[PDB]
Design a binder for this molecule. Structure first.
Ligand code: HEM
Ligand SMILES: [C-]#N
Length: 142
């Protein structure tokens, strides 16, 4: 279950982080990489083997941030549309699975995102529920 209140909170807070994504996106990745080394490992190719505390201001980081943001924005705009959600989720999972990434790792990411969102007026509880509904749709395909 997702209440109307949780959905409104997720949409408003995302709007705010979205306007600041130019600088916050990279901060989000750094926290993620700091919390899970296994996650950073999967980006070795994109980063060309560079060490973790060295990727923040790279052109690849900027690009990766914009990619992350475009999918999250689509999920957010369709919270009352399970059908739409399902389809976006299918592609996302097929793509990530093919890289050897686990359901557990995806889950890890959503947790760091929920905490991160607190800085933008986000209710951690509302982000956590949104993450569970999406995981319910991703898992069967992982
Ligand atoms: C859970 C929230 C996530 C979102 C919204 C997200 C979103 C995306 C999107 C939109 C793309 C580009 C389309 C594609 O190539 O699939 C992508 C690519 C990628 N993702 Fe994610 N992803 C997430 C989680 C992860 C995690 C946890 C990892 C690592 C364990 C990961 C690793 C990658 C890599 C390696 C690529 C390809 C980068 C390249 O172009 O070389 N993603 N992700
Ligand atoms: C990773 N997006």
């Amino acid at each position: 279950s997702l209440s109307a209140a949780q959905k409104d909170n997720v949409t408003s807070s995302w709007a705010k982080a979205s306007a600041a994504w130019g600088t916050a996106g990279p901060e989000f990745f750094m926290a993620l990489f700091d919390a899970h080394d296994d996650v950073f490992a999967k980006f070795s190719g994109l980063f060309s083997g560079a060490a973790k505390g060295t990727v923040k201001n790279t052109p690849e980081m900027a690009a990766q941030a914009q990619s992350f943001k475009g999918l999250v924005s689509n999920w957010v705009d369709n919270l009352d549309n399970a059908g739409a959600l399902e389809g976006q989720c299918k592609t996302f999972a097929a793509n990530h699975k093919a890289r050897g990434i686990s359901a557990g790792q995806l889950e890890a990411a959503f947790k760091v995102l929920s905490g991160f969102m607190k800085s933008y007026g986000g209710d951690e509880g509302a982000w956590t529920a949104v993450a569970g509904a999406l995981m319910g749709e991703i898992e069967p395909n992982m």
